[PDB]
Enzyme design. Structure first.
Site, short mmCIF file in Angstrom:
data_model
loop_
_atom_site.label_atom_id
_atom_site.label_comp_id
_atom_site.label_asym_id
_atom_site.label_seq_id
_atom_site.Cartn_x
_atom_site.Cartn_y
_atom_site.Cartn_z
N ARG A 82 0.82 -1.20 0.00
CA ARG A 82 0.00 0.00 0.00
C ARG A 82 0.85 1.25 0.00
O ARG A 82 2.06 1.19 0.22
CB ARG A 82 -0.88 0.02 1.25
CG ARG A 82 -0.12 0.43 2.50
CD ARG A 82 -1.04 0.73 3.67
NE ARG A 82 -0.44 1.69 4.59
CZ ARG A 82 0.43 1.38 5.54
NH1 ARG A 82 0.82 0.12 5.71
NH2 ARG A 82 0.92 2.32 6.33
N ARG A 92 6.12 2.72 -1.64
CA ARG A 92 5.04 1.88 -1.15
C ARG A 92 5.63 0.93 -0.12
O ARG A 92 6.85 0.87 0.04
CB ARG A 92 4.40 1.12 -2.31
CG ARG A 92 3.88 2.03 -3.42
CD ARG A 92 3.25 1.25 -4.56
NE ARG A 92 2.18 0.37 -4.09
CZ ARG A 92 0.90 0.69 -4.07
NH1 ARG A 92 0.50 1.88 -4.51
NH2 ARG A 92 0.01 -0.18 -3.61
N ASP A 95 7.95 -2.63 -2.83
CA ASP A 95 8.40 -2.18 -4.14
C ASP A 95 8.88 -3.35 -4.98
O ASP A 95 9.73 -4.12 -4.54
CB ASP A 95 9.55 -1.19 -4.01
CG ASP A 95 9.10 0.19 -3.57
OD1 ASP A 95 7.89 0.46 -3.58
OD2 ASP A 95 9.98 1.01 -3.22
N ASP A 97 10.54 -3.62 -8.69
CA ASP A 97 11.06 -2.88 -9.84
C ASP A 97 11.66 -3.80 -10.87
O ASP A 97 12.47 -4.66 -10.55
CB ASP A 97 12.13 -1.89 -9.39
CG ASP A 97 11.56 -0.73 -8.61
OD1 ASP A 97 10.82 0.07 -9.21
OD2 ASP A 97 11.86 -0.62 -7.40
#
Ligand SMILES: [Cl-]
Length: 158
Positions: A82, A92, A95, A97
Site C-alpha cells: 500500500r 510503497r 516495491d 522494480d
C-alpha cells in the site's frame, strides 16, 4: 527472456510480505523464478529511527512482453502492499522494480528499462551480482566493473 526484478520492503515487519511477494512472482503466467538472491538489509533513507529495508533480487524467466510483466508487478504491489497514509507519493510498503528485461532497452510512458537509477544503488546491484555475477548491461557495461570502479560498500545480510 530473463527479467531481473528488485524487491524492497521498508515495513517494520517485512520478511513475511517479501515471501508473499515471491510467491506472487512465481504465480505470474508464462513465467517462472530462476533464482532468488539472499535477503539484504539497508538503512532507512533520512531519519535513522525508521525501519531498515529488506532488499533482494529475483531472476524471472518469462515469455511475457515487458509491459505485460509490468502489469503483473503493478498488480502485486497493489495486492500485497500500500501507499503510506500521510505521504501518498513516497515508497510503497512493497516495491517491485523491473531492473532489466533481457538486453532490451525501453523508454515508454509506463516503463523505463534498465531501471533509471540502478547503477547508483548498491541495494539493487549487490543482490543482482549474487545471482548474475557475469551480467552485462544493454549498453555493454559489466556489472562486475560497475561494482569495482564505483567502489560500492557491501550490504549486510538481513
Ligand atoms: Cl544500460
Amino acid at each position: 527472456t530473463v527479467a531481473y526484478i528488485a524487491i524492497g520492503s521498508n515495513l517494520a515487519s517485512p520478511l513475511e510480505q517479501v515471501n508473499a511477494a515471491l510467491k506472487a512472482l512465481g504465480d505470474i503466467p508464462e513465467s517462472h523464478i530462476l533464482t532468488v538472491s539472499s535477503f539484504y538489509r539497508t538503512p532507512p533513507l533520512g531519519p535513522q529511527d525508521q525501519p531498515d529495508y529488506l532488499n533482494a533480487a529475483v531472476a524471472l524467466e518469462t515469455s511475457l512482453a515487458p509491459e505485460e510483466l509490468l502489469n503483473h508487478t503493478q498488480r502485486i504491489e497493489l495486492q500485497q502492499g500500500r501507499v503510506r497514509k500521510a505521504e501518498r507519493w513516497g515508497p510503497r510498503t512493497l516495491d517491485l522494480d523491473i531492473m532489466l528485461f533481457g538486453n532490451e532497452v525501453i523508454n515508454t510512458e509506463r516503463l523505463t528499462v534498465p531501471h533509471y537509477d540502478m547503477k547508483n544503488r548498491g541495494a539493487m546491484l549487490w543482490p543482482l551480482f549474487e545471482i548474475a555475477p557475469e551480467l552485462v548491461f544493454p549498453d555493454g557495461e559489466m556489472l562486475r566493473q560497475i561494482l569495482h570502479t564505483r567502489a560500492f560498500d557491501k550490504l549486510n545480510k538481513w
